[PDB]
């Protein structure tokens, strides 16, 4: 409570590729199936800002931001945040990675606040950021295991 999601999902690949594809942004409106686009608008050293647009919402609201991350391979973890907070107090949005007997875990962590005079309050954005994270994460999942599986039929067989 409140204003907190926290959604995990374990993919049967190794940490490498899982990580690999998960943080290969350019390629996410391939991955992903909610953005309708994402575009790189620069890169520090360690730090990439970006923008995300998503596909209309229920309302048919098209969402719209520039969010700025740091993603760090030694301890598979990311950091993101929103660079205008817009309707939000904040946001923020951790990812984190380990390797179980099952194969990779996952995990994603938002923690946020809606601005008083914002157009939704934070169990409606709370709802919509686990509904989708939810169906991101299944579709990630699918995705990396049939690159693995395929990558690994084409090893075996040569
Ligand atoms: C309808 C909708 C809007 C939306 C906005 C976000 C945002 O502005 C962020 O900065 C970060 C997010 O994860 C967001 C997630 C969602 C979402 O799942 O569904």
Redesign the pocket.
């Given at each position: 409570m409140a204003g907190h999601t926290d959604n995990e999902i374990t993919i049967a690949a190794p940490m490498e590729l899982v990580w690999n594809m998960t943080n290969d942004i350019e390629k996410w409106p391939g991955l992903f199936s909610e953005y309708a686009s994402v575009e790189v608008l620069g890169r520090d050293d360690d730090k990439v800002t970006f923008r995300l647009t998503?596909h209309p919402?229920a309302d048919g609201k098209v969402?719209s931001?520039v969010?700025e991350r740091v993603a760090d391979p030694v301890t598979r973890t990311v950091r993101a945040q929103?660079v205008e907070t817009?309707p939000?107090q904040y946001?923020n949005?951790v990812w984190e990675y380990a390797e179980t007997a099952e194969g990779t875990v996952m995990r994603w962590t938002?923690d946020f606040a809606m601005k008083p005079d914002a157009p939704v309050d934070d169990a409606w954005?709370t709802d919509?950021?686990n509904?989708?994270?939810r169906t991101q994460m299944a579709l990630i999942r699918d995705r990396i295991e049939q690159a693995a599986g395929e990558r690994r039929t084409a090893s075996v067989l040569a």
């Open positions: 998503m919402d969402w931001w969010s929103r817009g939000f946001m949005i938002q954005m919509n950021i509904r989708n994270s």
